[PDB]
């Protein structure tokens, strides 16, 4: 078993896609271990979540977007959950995300991309600790 | 503008219907204002939630069912949210719930009936205070 | 606990609605106890199935339609399955069938109406004996 | 055999519900006979379309809403199309529209109510002549 | 931004898949700029649309199919819309189109393949001019 | 045309995914030629179906799983049906099955993987003979 950290991003709320995204993960038989709803995540939490991106040109725009509406943070559990949910998520770039994936079917922007999912064992631990101290 | 208290019940987790149910409410344009995930709700919160039923023959079975798996408690907001979400929910009795409703389409038991929704303005305020003190 | 006899009619095959219909019953938590596929049902079984209608003006057209493509016969089991699946099915007359029902959502004709369901305990036993001797 | 005039309203474009609505009518086996896309309908066509309501308190707000985004005008054909599509549409008042209907499932406002459908044979002929001269 | 030309082909109408196809594009957040419904496209227009195929053995059969029922022509707009909608469309050959794509999920023939989408900037301009002079 | 043998496995019944799986194949325009429902398949039939796996460590566990609940066996017909339905099915391994495929969207285990489909012309003939003597 692994646990991974998923964020449902503000664009999912704006576009009424929260259940659609959560449903795709639920239909794959992953179980919710923890879940929190944020009317607006504190900016500092967002900066910590994306600390590895602090020197990128998009960092401030990314943080602005992430505090622009609600987020749901979820810890999902399942065998090899980290890599599996990453494959369901799809690539960041709308020129690459595959039809059938969450981003491939539903996202059309590199930043407004509906969902975060941890990318490794090492980062899942870190991100779960940020959202679920 | 009103707020109402919804519970997604343990049978919805068992049957992987959590997103199906949340999605019916989301598509009606109701907004999540608060939400908590309970791996197992405390017995006392369940008994207070259903205090009106404490002397009924089904009370202990009801409470046992409600602590038999996870629940999600959600506060939804919208114009006339209380009556509107009650109408979406459908009748308790599976002989009465109408096709098109959540229970009419998906529930087949008087107790394992997937969803709670507050039945009035006063009970909404009460139930919101129980789950979101 | 009851068993009822359902027919998926030839129009459902023509319109690729077989799984749509079976899925509405499956989501209501009814269980398949028996099922047979008929590439073309024998005329005699159809005439016995609809024996009550043998002197009606529409009888020959009804029987011709019923042998015009495949049918699936299914026995479903569940608490009060007979009445519950009748309610899912919807009224025969397309001017009456309610949205949310199988016929209300999907059927637009009094004869090409997608689904048969037994109407009573005695007719269920009779119809089950016809299709599953 | 009848023809009826449907408008997909600006809120359906805003909420990405255009195909959801058209699909409910398509699944009922109604056929498109004519269809036009309006990036913004002319104010005069809207006022003629809703001429019966010209002296009502909500008329200006109604017309403003109707020119606030795109509309699709569609002529649908089928047996008793007028009454049948009215039944699919659902009651104007969100306190009354039934789950299973388009408005009952998806609309939450008396004005932003997603779909227009002709209410009678004579109004269908009138409305078809307005949108498809 | 780019604009691309999409055709919903006659097999989509025969199989009641119009809304399903349009919905997949709508859920990806592309916007309709122009749309026309054709009860039957003129053969000459089809020959112009597929002028590059005039020497292929399938040309006449392709033109016959394209005039065999209705078409909807749509101009969609979005960032990199041309390549993105091509990826949603899927490969022409049913041995290759990927599950998750429109053709991969829904088409089972090289010619009756539900949807056209422009393949380049150069051809989008040309095709938009054909369908929307 | 080819005919291929599909099994809907016991986990599909446990998880109420029978219609979901059958629907994906039906939407691709494959036709049912034969179908049988098994309340519980005889173990010997399962051992014959998987005879090529008799020396693998998972063989007994695989046979136990296959008799743990109902199966539906279906013969589907269509051009290149064998390879096409294999591509819809997706890879056995949940680390590899692609989003958009049946297993990629819905299965999370190497053994509880919802669906069997014949892998070649040679094995389809053999498997059809086992389930449909
Ligand atoms: C690469 C990239 C990322 N971002 C934002 C959106 C990404 O979800 C977030 C983190 O990037 P990254 O970790 O590369 O992507 P993913 O979300 O697929 O794991 O940064 C941009 O805004 N612009 C960019 O060019
Ligand atoms: C009336 C009734 C309720 N219950 C349980 C299931 C109900 O969801 C719960 C509360 O009853 P109630 O408030 O009547 O129903 P609803 O949930 O529709 O508002 O009690 C039974 O188990 N048996 C019964 O006969
Ligand atoms: C009443 C009626 C039925 N039929 C056909 C279609 C019905 O499914 C079938 C049996 O009629 P009935 O038992 O009245 O309907 P249901 O199928 O709703 O139980 O007869 C007609 O063709 N015309 C009619 O006027
Ligand atoms: C009755 C009513 C209608 N309207 C608007 C929305 C309605 O779609 C439109 C026409 O009214 P009406 O013809 O009564 O409704 P319907 O659309 O159900 O046929 O006028 C209001 O804004 N407020 C109102 O109180
Ligand atoms: C290649 C090919 C195309 N066609 C038809 C169907 C195609 O949609 C149309 C144009 O071909 P093409 O431009 O290759 O495909 P696409 O539609 O994927 O851009 O020609 C055939 O009928 N047979 C064939 O072998
Ligand atoms: C390879 C493998 C198969 N199996 C079971 C599940 C497979 O569906 C079945 C037959 O294997 P195989 O023919 O390799 O897979 P497929 O079902 O994709 O054609 O054996 C295991 O239980 N464990 C394993 O490691
Ligand atoms: Mg990342
Ligand atoms: Mg109550
Ligand atoms: Mg009857
Ligand atoms: Mg009106
Ligand atoms: Mg091309
Ligand atoms: Mg195999």
PDB file of N, CA, C and O in Angstrom, chain A residues 27-30 80 83-84 87-88 99-101, chain F residues 15 95-99 103-108:
ATOM      1  N   UNK A  27     -13.749   5.193  -8.907  1.00  0.00           N
ATOM      2  CA  UNK A  27     -14.065   4.052  -9.789  1.00  0.00           C
ATOM      3  C   UNK A  27     -12.865   3.126  -9.988  1.00  0.00           C
ATOM      4  O   UNK A  27     -13.034   1.970 -10.396  1.00  0.00           O
ATOM      5  N   UNK A  28     -11.664   3.637  -9.731  1.00  0.00           N
ATOM      6  CA  UNK A  28     -10.447   2.833  -9.819  1.00  0.00           C
ATOM      7  C   UNK A  28     -10.184   2.094  -8.519  1.00  0.00           C
ATOM      8  O   UNK A  28      -9.224   1.355  -8.400  1.00  0.00           O
ATOM      9  N   UNK A  29     -11.051   2.274  -7.525  1.00  0.00           N
ATOM     10  CA  UNK A  29     -11.004   1.518  -6.275  1.00  0.00           C
ATOM     11  C   UNK A  29      -9.985   2.001  -5.248  1.00  0.00           C
ATOM     12  O   UNK A  29      -9.586   1.246  -4.360  1.00  0.00           O
ATOM     13  N   UNK A  30      -9.609   3.276  -5.326  1.00  0.00           N
ATOM     14  CA  UNK A  30      -8.815   3.884  -4.277  1.00  0.00           C
ATOM     15  C   UNK A  30      -9.686   4.409  -3.153  1.00  0.00           C
ATOM     16  O   UNK A  30     -10.796   4.872  -3.372  1.00  0.00           O
ATOM     17  N   UNK A  80       0.384   0.794  -4.923  1.00  0.00           N
ATOM     18  CA  UNK A  80       1.052   1.633  -5.925  1.00  0.00           C
ATOM     19  C   UNK A  80       0.208   2.858  -6.251  1.00  0.00           C
ATOM     20  O   UNK A  80       0.219   3.334  -7.387  1.00  0.00           O
ATOM     21  N   UNK A  83       1.981   6.181  -8.315  1.00  0.00           N
ATOM     22  CA  UNK A  83       2.136   6.141  -9.756  1.00  0.00           C
ATOM     23  C   UNK A  83       0.824   5.947 -10.475  1.00  0.00           C
ATOM     24  O   UNK A  83       0.633   6.503 -11.552  1.00  0.00           O
ATOM     25  N   UNK A  84      -0.090   5.188  -9.896  1.00  0.00           N
ATOM     26  CA  UNK A  84      -1.356   4.949 -10.603  1.00  0.00           C
ATOM     27  C   UNK A  84      -2.180   6.237 -10.728  1.00  0.00           C
ATOM     28  O   UNK A  84      -2.780   6.504 -11.791  1.00  0.00           O
ATOM     29  N   UNK A  87      -0.816   8.463 -13.349  1.00  0.00           N
ATOM     30  CA  UNK A  87      -1.189   8.090 -14.714  1.00  0.00           C
ATOM     31  C   UNK A  87      -2.635   8.495 -15.014  1.00  0.00           C
ATOM     32  O   UNK A  87      -2.938   8.925 -16.136  1.00  0.00           O
ATOM     33  N   UNK A  88      -3.532   8.380 -14.030  1.00  0.00           N
ATOM     34  CA  UNK A  88      -4.907   8.858 -14.239  1.00  0.00           C
ATOM     35  C   UNK A  88      -4.940  10.356 -14.428  1.00  0.00           C
ATOM     36  O   UNK A  88      -5.779  10.865 -15.131  1.00  0.00           O
ATOM     37  N   UNK A  99      -6.071  11.652 -24.020  1.00  0.00           N
ATOM     38  CA  UNK A  99      -7.489  11.347 -23.876  1.00  0.00           C
ATOM     39  C   UNK A  99      -7.663  10.110 -23.002  1.00  0.00           C
ATOM     40  O   UNK A  99      -6.903   9.123 -23.108  1.00  0.00           O
ATOM     41  N   UNK A 100      -8.628  10.186 -22.093  1.00  0.00           N
ATOM     42  CA  UNK A 100      -8.811   9.122 -21.113  1.00  0.00           C
ATOM     43  C   UNK A 100      -8.316   9.504 -19.725  1.00  0.00           C
ATOM     44  O   UNK A 100      -8.801   8.967 -18.739  1.00  0.00           O
ATOM     45  N   UNK A 101      -7.333  10.399 -19.670  1.00  0.00           N
ATOM     46  CA  UNK A 101      -6.872  10.918 -18.383  1.00  0.00           C
ATOM     47  C   UNK A 101      -7.713  12.100 -17.960  1.00  0.00           C
ATOM     48  O   UNK A 101      -8.488  12.680 -18.765  1.00  0.00           O
TER      49      UNK A 101
ATOM     50  N   UNK F  15     -18.783  -5.474  -7.716  1.00  0.00           N
ATOM     51  CA  UNK F  15     -18.661  -4.017  -7.780  1.00  0.00           C
ATOM     52  C   UNK F  15     -19.702  -3.319  -8.642  1.00  0.00           C
ATOM     53  O   UNK F  15     -19.614  -2.112  -8.863  1.00  0.00           O
ATOM     54  N   UNK F  95      -0.163  -1.471 -13.229  1.00  0.00           N
ATOM     55  CA  UNK F  95       0.873  -0.469 -13.450  1.00  0.00           C
ATOM     56  C   UNK F  95       0.976  -0.033 -14.907  1.00  0.00           C
ATOM     57  O   UNK F  95       1.644   0.955 -15.222  1.00  0.00           O
ATOM     58  N   UNK F  96       0.294  -0.755 -15.803  1.00  0.00           N
ATOM     59  CA  UNK F  96       0.415  -0.521 -17.229  1.00  0.00           C
ATOM     60  C   UNK F  96      -0.915  -0.205 -17.945  1.00  0.00           C
ATOM     61  O   UNK F  96      -0.909   0.496 -18.959  1.00  0.00           O
ATOM     62  N   UNK F  97      -2.044  -0.716 -17.445  1.00  0.00           N
ATOM     63  CA  UNK F  97      -3.285  -0.538 -18.198  1.00  0.00           C
ATOM     64  C   UNK F  97      -3.595   0.945 -18.349  1.00  0.00           C
ATOM     65  O   UNK F  97      -3.493   1.716 -17.390  1.00  0.00           O
ATOM     66  N   UNK F  98      -3.978   1.331 -19.551  1.00  0.00           N
ATOM     67  CA  UNK F  98      -4.058   2.755 -19.882  1.00  0.00           C
ATOM     68  C   UNK F  98      -5.393   3.368 -19.495  1.00  0.00           C
ATOM     69  O   UNK F  98      -6.423   2.756 -19.711  1.00  0.00           O
ATOM     70  N   UNK F  99      -5.380   4.585 -18.924  1.00  0.00           N
ATOM     71  CA  UNK F  99      -6.628   5.320 -18.765  1.00  0.00           C
ATOM     72  C   UNK F  99      -7.383   5.343 -20.089  1.00  0.00           C
ATOM     73  O   UNK F  99      -6.790   5.507 -21.178  1.00  0.00           O
ATOM     74  N   UNK F 103      -9.792  -1.904 -17.951  1.00  0.00           N
ATOM     75  CA  UNK F 103      -8.940  -2.132 -16.795  1.00  0.00           C
ATOM     76  C   UNK F 103      -8.237  -0.856 -16.312  1.00  0.00           C
ATOM     77  O   UNK F 103      -8.099  -0.642 -15.110  1.00  0.00           O
ATOM     78  N   UNK F 104      -7.836  -0.001 -17.253  1.00  0.00           N
ATOM     79  CA  UNK F 104      -7.155   1.252 -16.899  1.00  0.00           C
ATOM     80  C   UNK F 104      -8.054   2.173 -16.076  1.00  0.00           C
ATOM     81  O   UNK F 104      -7.592   2.875 -15.156  1.00  0.00           O
ATOM     82  N   UNK F 105      -9.349   2.171 -16.375  1.00  0.00           N
ATOM     83  CA  UNK F 105     -10.277   3.047 -15.636  1.00  0.00           C
ATOM     84  C   UNK F 105     -10.829   2.404 -14.369  1.00  0.00           C
ATOM     85  O   UNK F 105     -11.125   3.094 -13.400  1.00  0.00           O
ATOM     86  N   UNK F 106     -10.981   1.082 -14.394  1.00  0.00           N
ATOM     87  CA  UNK F 106     -11.822   0.424 -13.387  1.00  0.00           C
ATOM     88  C   UNK F 106     -11.151  -0.677 -12.551  1.00  0.00           C
ATOM     89  O   UNK F 106     -11.665  -1.007 -11.474  1.00  0.00           O
ATOM     90  N   UNK F 107     -10.024  -1.220 -12.993  1.00  0.00           N
ATOM     91  CA  UNK F 107      -9.405  -2.347 -12.271  1.00  0.00           C
ATOM     92  C   UNK F 107      -8.152  -1.909 -11.565  1.00  0.00           C
ATOM     93  O   UNK F 107      -7.372  -1.117 -12.087  1.00  0.00           O
ATOM     94  N   UNK F 108      -7.931  -2.444 -10.378  1.00  0.00           N
ATOM     95  CA  UNK F 108      -6.754  -2.054  -9.615  1.00  0.00           C
ATOM     96  C   UNK F 108      -5.976  -3.262  -9.104  1.00  0.00           C
ATOM     97  O   UNK F 108      -5.252  -3.156  -8.116  1.00  0.00           O
TER      98      UNK F 108
END
